[PDB]
Amino acid sequence: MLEAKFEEASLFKRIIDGFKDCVQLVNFQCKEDGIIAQAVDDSRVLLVSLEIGVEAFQEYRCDHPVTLGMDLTSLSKILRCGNNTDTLTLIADNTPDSIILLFEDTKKDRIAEYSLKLMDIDADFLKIEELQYDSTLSLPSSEFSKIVRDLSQLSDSINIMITKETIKFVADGDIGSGSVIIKPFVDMEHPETSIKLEMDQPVDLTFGAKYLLDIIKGSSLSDRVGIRLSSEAPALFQFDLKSGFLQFFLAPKFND
């Protein structure tokens, strides 16, 4: 029960590229108001949630909810075959056993259809608890990715401190240390590079380098990343989209 039609095909390619490294199995839940998906890695440190609304559909028909498990390695391999001219169409029957990926052009009769077998891991746990965050900040995805790949070389743990009207990234390692402090600004030419920060309470907590590199590979989805920080709570790193958002729930580290 799914008639998913995408106006652009490569956007879903960046969507799965964001999913790729973090987790290898997601059981998608397709509903009448769009497609949602949530998964947790094997180490139970990183939680990925995907929200896709009807706004990113030329036409959508999902009258009955459908559970869709699909290998992201196989989907990535087959989605690399999608041209920039063809458009994606997802079709699922009653109790699907193989999801069909369909491509159609506009000026030439070129049809590309593919079949993907599903999984039956029987895991559909969806848990969301944190709806408030002490610190909310946004910055370009390229900038945050640059900072994290800059500080991951020195240490396996990167601190994100939020001191009064300033952002501070600290990473102390064997070969040395590194402190990248940035201050919010409003670029009058365009807000695409502006740094916005909301300050309620000071925030001081450390994360993992490998996990942070796992989140920042979703920078292809959107040019802006929203970071929500709060003490003794899962951090949030969202990538805004036209119909929804792709946010990551990450577990901090204990220093004692």
Partner 1 sequence: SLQLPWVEKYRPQVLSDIVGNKETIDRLQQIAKDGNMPHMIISGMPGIGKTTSVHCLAHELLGRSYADGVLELNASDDRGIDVVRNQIKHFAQKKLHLPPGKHKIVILDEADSMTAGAQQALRRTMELYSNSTRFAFACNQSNKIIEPLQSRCAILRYSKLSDEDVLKRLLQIIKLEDVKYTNDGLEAIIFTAEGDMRQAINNLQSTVAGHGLVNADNVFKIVDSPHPLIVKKMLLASNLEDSIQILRTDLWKKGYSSIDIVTTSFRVTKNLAQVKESVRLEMIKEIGLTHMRILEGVGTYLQLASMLAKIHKLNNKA
Partner 2 sequence: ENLPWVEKYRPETLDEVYGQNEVITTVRKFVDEGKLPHLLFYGPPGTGKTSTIVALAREIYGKNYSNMVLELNASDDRGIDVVRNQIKDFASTRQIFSKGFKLIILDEADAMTNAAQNALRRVIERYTKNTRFCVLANYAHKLTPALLSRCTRFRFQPLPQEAIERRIANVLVHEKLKLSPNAEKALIELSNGDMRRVLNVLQSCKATLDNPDEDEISDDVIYECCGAPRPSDLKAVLKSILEDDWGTAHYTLNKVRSAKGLALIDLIEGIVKILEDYELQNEETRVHLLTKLADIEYSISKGGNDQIQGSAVIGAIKASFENET
Partner 3 sequence: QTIMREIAGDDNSYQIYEVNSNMNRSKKDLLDILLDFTTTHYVK
**Binding-site ranges for partner 2 (CB under 8 A):** 43-45, 47, 234, 249, 251-254, 256
Q: Which of 95, 106, 132, 255 binds partner 1 (CB under 8 A)?
A: 95
Of the pair 42, 165, the CB lying nearest partner 3 is at 42
What is the rounded distance in angstroms from the CA atom of residue 116 to the CA atom of residue 193?
A: 40
Rg of the chain in Å (alpha carbons) = 20
Residues interacting with its own copies, by CB under 8 A? 71, 74, 77-78, 81, 98, 108-117, 150, 153-154, 174-183, 185
Q: Is 251 in the site for partner 3 (CB under 8 A)?
A: yes
- Of 135 and 157, the one with the shorter C-beta distance to partner 3 is 157
x/- site string to partner 3, residues 121 to 160, per CB under 8 A? Answer: -----x----------------------------------
User: Mask 173-212, x = binds partner 3 (CB under 8 A)?
Assistant: -----------------------------------x-xx-
- For the purposes of burial, counting CB atoms within 10 Å of the CB of 240, is it exposed (0-12), middle (13-18) or buried (19 or more)? middle
Is residue 240 within a helix (H) or strand (E), and if so which, with residue range? strand 235-240
The DSSP annotation for 120-148 comes to --------------SEEEEEEHHHHHHHH
Binding partner 3 by CB under 8 A: which of 45, 62, 90, 167? 45
Contact between 117 and partner 1 per CB under 8 A: yes
Tokens of 218: 């979703």
Considering only residues 15, 26, 47, 99, which one is a binding residue for partner 3 as defined by CB under 8 A? 47
Q: How far apart are CA 151 and CA 13, in angstroms?
A: 28
Stretch that binds partner 1, among 41-49, 113-121, 153-161, 193-201 (CB under 8 A): 113-121
Give yes or no for a contact between 121 and 71, defined as CB atoms under 8 angstroms apart: no
Neighbouring residues of 217: CB distance < 8 A, sequence distance ≥ 6: 17, 18, 20, 21
Residue 166 or 231: which CB sits closer to its own copies? Answer: 166
In which residue are the tokens 């799914």 written? 2
Q: Which residues pair with 86 in a beta bridge?
A: none
120 touches which of partner 3, partner 1, partner 2, none (CB within 5 to 8 A by kind)?
A: partner 1
Q: How far apart are CA 175 and CA 177, in angstroms?
A: 7
